[PDB]
Each structure stands twice: as C-alpha cells, then as structure tokens.
Design an enzyme around this catalytic site. Sequence first.
Site, mmCIF file in Angstrom:
data_model
loop_
_atom_site.group_PDB
_atom_site.id
_atom_site.type_symbol
_atom_site.label_atom_id
_atom_site.label_comp_id
_atom_site.label_asym_id
_atom_site.label_seq_id
_atom_site.Cartn_x
_atom_site.Cartn_y
_atom_site.Cartn_z
ATOM 1 N N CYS A 50 -68.757 23.804 160.275
ATOM 2 C CA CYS A 50 -68.518 23.536 158.858
ATOM 3 C C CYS A 50 -69.422 24.361 157.944
ATOM 4 O O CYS A 50 -68.964 24.954 156.954
ATOM 5 C CB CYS A 50 -68.761 22.051 158.559
ATOM 6 N N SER A 51 -70.712 24.377 158.266
ATOM 7 C CA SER A 51 -71.721 25.013 157.406
ATOM 8 C C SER A 51 -71.807 26.521 157.586
ATOM 9 O O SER A 51 -72.025 27.247 156.618
ATOM 10 C CB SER A 51 -73.112 24.420 157.708
#
Lengths: 169, 171
Positions: A56-57
């Site tokens: 995600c990051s």
Amino acid sequence: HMIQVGDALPDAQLFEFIDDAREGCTLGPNACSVRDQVAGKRVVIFGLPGAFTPTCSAQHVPGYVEHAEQLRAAGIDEIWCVSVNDAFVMGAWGRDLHTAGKVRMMADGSAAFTHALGLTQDLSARGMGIRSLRYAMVIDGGVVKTLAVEAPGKFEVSDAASVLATLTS
Amino acid sequence: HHHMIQVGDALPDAQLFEFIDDAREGCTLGPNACSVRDQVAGKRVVIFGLPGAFTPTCSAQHVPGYVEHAEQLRAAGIDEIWCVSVNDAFVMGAWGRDLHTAGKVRMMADGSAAFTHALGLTQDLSARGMGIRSLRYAMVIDGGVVKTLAVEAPGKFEVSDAASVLATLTS
C-alpha cells in the site's frame, strides 16, 4: 453481494483529515457523504487493506500520486484512496506520502462503505481484523463504470498505470 | 459479547502483534505475533488500553505520561508497560516511533480486537469513523491475574493515566 459495473454507488459516511484551514471545513477529521462527494464528478476510487502497510505505502498510493496529473488531464476529477482506517491514521499516512492535492485520503474506519460495496475481507490472521479488498473503480454519474478487484494478496489490476490505460470513451 | 474483566480474574490469552524494527533473536523485522499469557508469564505488567493510535488525547497525554513515568514504574517493580489498542502493528509501530516509546512502552497491536473482546472492554466508536475499538483503561497484572483495574467512563480520562497507576500500586 459484490458491487458491479452499472450499479449506483452506495452512500456511506467517510471522513477526511484536513490539515489546513479550508471553508465549510474544520481542522482534523471532516465527515462526508460518498454520494454527495461523487455527484457530478468523474472519480477514481482505489481501496486497499491498510494505511502504513508495505505494498500500500511503497507502491499502490505512490503510483496514484505519480499518475495524478495524467489521470486529471484524461478527465478524472478526483482520486480517492479508501481504507478501513480512521481519519487520524489516514491523515498521518497522507502527510507521510505527500498526497495533498493529488489523492484524497478517505477513511472508512467503521468499514461501512466497504461493507455496502461487498468488498471486505477478514485479515484477522495478521492482526488487522476486517479490512478492504484491494481494488480500483471509476465512477461517473454516481454509477460504477469499471471495477477491478484483486484476488487476495495480489496487485495486478488496481494500480494507477492499469487504470489510466483502461479509461474509456 | 463477553462480560467485563474484574479484579482477581486471570488475564485471558489472545494473539497480539508488536512491530520490531531492530534485529533481535527470536524476532523478525516488522510485526511479530505473541501470546498475551506467554508474555505476562512471570512478570509484573502495566497494561493501558486506549481507543486509537494517532488520536489527540491518546497521543498528547495518555502515552506520553507512561513514557514519562516509565523509569519510576520500573523502580517500583513493574517489568513491562504495554499500550494496547485496536490498531494493526504497522500503525502501532509508526506511532511508537513518533512518540519515542522504544524500551519504555511496548506498543501492542490488538488490530482484530480479539484481546479487547476477551476482556469485555470494547466500545462502538462508529459515529466518529473508528468502528469497534477499546475503552480507555489501565490494569496491573501479576501472576497472570488482574490486581487492579481502572476503566474509564466513555470520553473520560481521570483514572488510567500513569500518575494514577503509580499512586495505586500496592504492597
């Protein structure tokens, strides 16, 4: 039952952490209506399993921050990152990933929206409880126009490059 | 779902995760699962639970009081201080680094709310977009048993702060 192409997007209350003085807004978490916020706009929404998690990051959010210019030139009005996280956490995550003005960090911390979409998954085994599947959708006239939901653990269809490539006339 | 834990009760087991960023034997980098009963075995432990990482009273007041008091609590015989929250370990890890908790307060992720449910200490914070989370509390555990328990009324912070806990340690 899962959301599908052609469907009207269900309403839900989301929160966005606002870091700056803005009008009709207060500092910090501001509630909003999904249906109110997509009215009359063309919006890409990508859901993902959690703020501060590796793929995600490192990949998913940055791909959208990096593609924001091209997505907007192609006619997208707003790009939302939706996660089953509260707005304080989404706000900190957004400040870390430099998302301001490019991707709205939209908190679905009660999983209300993700549930109404039929797109939750149980990540209890990882200490995360109920979270969203990873996906991208494009909304126009409040209706789902395209929907790309990932098989659990995969990241093949919901990234910003695939989305830009599949916008349509 | 479960009745609320009480003074004198055995602490229930649950699986928690702590984000570990240095290399250490028996651990891997990032989230590490651990058993509540296994980690409190043979220790005297203060556990304070709170509603969420990165929230204002939690961040400005509740965790810093424990970081601030950690030396005094350890001098009084407390082996570990845990912060428990219904958040996953990636978020608890980042929060702990922001608050300089390393070596003073273990940031114990209960992101499935399994422990908090087993304690009977959940509340519904849906109205503020947080869903099911923990009540704010502090307890002291010794011999695997709850020796003191201080649970806050919703939205209150008058009994679970580090000062109150230090004041109520007993012989």
